[PDB]
Write a protein that binds this ligand. Structure first.
Ligand code: ADP
Ligand code: MG
Ligand code: ZN
Length: 531
C-alpha cells in the first residue's frame, strides 16, 4: 500500500474549493483520516484505491470531487438499495444526483440519457448497476458521447472487491468494467472497499486495467471501542430483560444498535424492547427509501434510542454518536463482527461493543451457513473468540486484518484486559470418552443426536434407549456441560453433521476426526477455565 503522507496537504490547486465544498455543501468541519489524501489523488486525475472500514466515510471521497469537477462522476454500485441510500443523503444536501437500473421507467431513462450529454446539466453523480455497462447498448452509447462532450470525467467503483470472484458478493458483471478505464482513459478511476486482502485488491486492479494505482489503507484499529463478550441466557424473554437492564444501567438515553441474526429476530426484539420501555426501531437493507429516512430522523431526534439491525448485506445505519453496539447473536465471521461492531464511536469518544455468546447459536448459525464452503470454519473462529479468556480481544480481531491493523496497545479497552482473573487447566478426557460411547451407541441404533439429545443422554435423561447402561451422569451445571461440548467441537474431538428437512437445516453431533487420539491412554484433553 502507498504512503499517503505526501498527499495530506491543503495546498493543491483545488484545496480552496475542496475546503469550501466540504464545509458549505456537505456541512462537515474536518476530514477523517485518508479522506483528504484520497480526494487529492483523484483531483489530480490519478487512479486511487481506498481501503476503509464500513462507516469510515468512503462515499465522501468520490462525492466531493464530483462537486469540484466538471461534468459528472459515474458510480458503479452493486445494489439498488445502496444507490438509494446515497441519493437520500445527496438530496438533503442539495446535490443533483440520479440512478439507473434495469427497472427504471422509460421517462426517467430518457431524461438521464439527455442530461449526460447536456453540457449545462446539474447532474454531478450518476449511479448505475454493472448491468448498465455489460448489458445496455444504449447507455454505453450515451457514455461515449458524454466522454466526447468532456462531461464523463470520473469513475467510482463502489465495493471494488466485487470485481474479483475471490472477494465476497462477487458479481460476474463486474468483470466487464475494465472497458471504462481502457477506452475512456481521461476519466480517472477510484475504487472503494472495506475488504483489505491484497489478493482481491490487486486482482481488482488488473480487471479494471488500473494497475498503475495508488492504494491507501486506513487504520482498522478503533482505540476508543471497548470489546466485551457476555454469556447469553437460554430463555429469550430472560435475555432481552438483561439487555434492557444493561442499556438502562450503562447507556441511559444514549443511542445504540442491536444486531440480530434474522429479520424475524429483528422485529421481535424491537417490540419486546418497546414494551419494556426502550424506544426501539427496526432497520433493514431492503426497506423502502421513505421508511429508512424515518428510522434515521426518529433516531436523530432521539425518538428511538435503539436501532435493531438485520446484519446481512446492504446496511444503512451509520450515526456518529452510537455509544453501544449489542450483538444479539454472534456474527458469521470475525471480519463481519469487526465491521458490524465498528459502527460504534464514530465521534471518537468511548463506545462499547457487546457480543452475546450462546451455545445454541453455534448450531443455529452453523446450519444457516451450510452452503458456504468456509462458513463453518469462519463461525468456529467466532466461537473461539467468544471462548477466549486469556488474550486481549483486540489482538484476536487484529489477526484477521494483518495488513491494515496497527500493533497499538489496547490499554484496558476490552474485557479480557480489564478483568483481574487467573486461569487453570482441568482434565476433561473422561468426559469425552463418555460422549463418544453415547455417540457410538446412537450410531449403533441408527440414531442422530442433536446437542440437546446428547446432553440429555449424558445427564441420564431423555429417551432411555439412548442412555448408555453404565454411564454415571457428569453432575456438572448444564452450562459447564455446554462449554465442554463446544470445546470438543472446536478441537474436533466432535464434529457437526447436518440433516435437511422440508423447511430447516438441523445440526447433529458425531464423533470427530481427533477422537482416535483417545485410543492411546497417554492422551489428555484439558480446558482453560477461570480460577
Ligand atoms: N469527514 C467527515 N466528518 C463527519 N462525518 C463524516 C465524514 N465523512 C463521512 N462522514 C459520515 O460517515 C457516515 C458513513 O459514511 P459512508 O460514506 O456511508 O461510509 P462507507 O461508505 O465507508 O461505509 C455518513 O453518515 C457520513 O455522513
Ligand atoms: Mg459505502
Ligand atoms: Zn485488550
Amino acid at each position: 500500500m502507498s504512503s499517503p503522507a505526501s498527499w495530506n496537504k491543503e495546498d493543491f490547486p483545488w484545496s480552496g474549493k475542496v475546503k469550501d465544498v466540504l464545509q458549505n455543501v456537505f456541512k462537515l468541519q474536518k476530514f477523517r483520516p485518508l479522506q483528504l489524501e484520497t480526494i487529492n489523488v483523484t483531483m489530480s486525475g490519478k487512479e486511487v484505491f481506498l481501503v476503509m472500514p464500513t462507516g469510515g466515510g468512503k462515499s465522501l471521497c468520490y462525492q466531493l470531487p464530483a462537486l469540484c469537477s466538471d461534468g459528472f462522476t459515474l458510480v458503479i454500485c452493486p445494489l439498488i438499495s445502496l444507490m438509494e441510500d446515497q441519493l437520500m443523503v445527496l438530496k438533503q444536501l442539495g446535490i443533483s444526483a440520479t440512478m439507473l437500473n434495469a427497472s427504471s421507467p422509460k421517462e426517467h431513462v430518457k431524461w438521464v440519457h439527455a442530461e449526460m450529454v447536456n453540457k449545462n446539466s446539474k447532474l454531478k453523480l450518476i449511479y448505475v448497476t454493472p448491468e448498465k455497462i455489460a448489458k445496455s447498448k444504449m447507455f454505453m452509447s450515451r457514455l461515449e458521447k458524454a466522454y466526447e462532450a468532456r462531461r464523463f470525467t470520473r469513475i467510482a467503483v463502489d465495493e471494488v472487491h466485487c470485481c474479483s470472484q475471490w472477494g465476497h458478493d462477487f458479481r460476474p458483471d463486474y468483470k466487464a468494467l475494465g472497458i471504462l478505464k481502457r477506452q475512456f482513459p481521461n476519466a480517472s478511476l477510484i475504487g472503494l472497499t472495506a475488504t483489505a486482502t491484497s489478493h482481491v485488491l490487486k486482482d481488482a486492479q488488473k480487471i479494471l486495467c488500473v494497475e498503475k494505482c495508488f492504494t491507501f489503507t486506513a487504520s482498522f484499529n478503533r482505540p476508543n471501542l471497548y470489546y466485551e463478550v457476555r454469556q447469553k441466557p437460554s430463555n429469550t424473554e430472560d435475555f432481552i430483560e438483561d439487555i434492557v437492564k444493561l442499556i438502562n444501567g450503562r447507556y441511559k438515553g444514549q443511542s445504540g444498535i442491536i444486531y440480530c441474526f434474522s429479520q424475524k429476530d429483528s422485529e421481535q426484539v424491537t417490540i419486546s424492547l418497546q414494551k419494556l420501555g426502550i424506544p426501539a426501531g427496526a432497520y433493514h437493507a431492503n426497506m423502502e427509501p421513505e421508511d429508512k429516512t424515518k428510522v434515521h430522523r426518529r433516531w436523530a431526534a432521539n425518538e428511538i434510542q435503539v436501532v435493531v439491525a438485520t446484519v446481512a448485506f446492504g446496511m444503512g445505519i451509520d450515526k456518529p454518536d452510537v455509544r453501544f453496539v449489542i450483538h444479539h447473536s454472534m456474527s458469521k465471521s470475525m471480519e463481519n463482527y469487526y465491521q458490524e461492531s465498528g459502527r460504534a464511536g464514530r465521534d471518537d469518544m468511548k463506545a462499547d461493543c457487546i457480543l452475546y455468546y450462546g451455545f445454541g447459536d453455534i448450531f443455529r448459525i452453523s446450519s444457516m451457513v451450510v452452503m458456504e464452503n468456509v462458513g463453518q470454519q469462519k463461525l468456529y473462529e467466532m466461537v473461539s473468540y467468544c471462548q477466549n479468556i486469556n488474550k486481549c480481544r483486540r489482538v484476536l480481531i487484529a489477526q484477521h486484518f494483518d495488513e491494515v491493523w496497527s500493533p497499538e496497545a489496547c490499554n484496558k479497552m476490552c474485557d479480557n484486559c480489564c478483568k483481574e482473573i487467573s486461569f487453570e487447566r482441568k482434565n476433561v478426557t473422561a468426559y469425552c470418552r463418555d460422549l463418544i460411547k453415547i455417540l457410538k451407541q446412537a450410531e449403533d441404533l441408527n440414531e442422530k443426536l442433536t446437542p440437546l439429545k446428547l446432553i440429555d443422554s449424558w445427564m441420564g435423561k431423555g429417551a432411555s434407549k439412548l442412555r448408555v447402561a453404565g454411564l454415571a451422569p457428569p453432575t456438572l451445571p448444564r452450562e459447564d456441560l455446554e462449554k465442554i461440548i463446544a470445546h470438543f467441537l472446536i478441537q474436533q474431538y466432535l464434529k457437526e453433521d447436518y440433516s435437511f428437512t422440508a423447511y430447516a437445516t438441523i445440526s447433529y453431533l458425531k464423533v470427530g476426526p481427533k477422537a482416535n487420539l483417545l485410543n492411546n491412554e497417554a492422551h489428555v484433553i484439558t480446558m482453560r477455565v477461570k480460577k
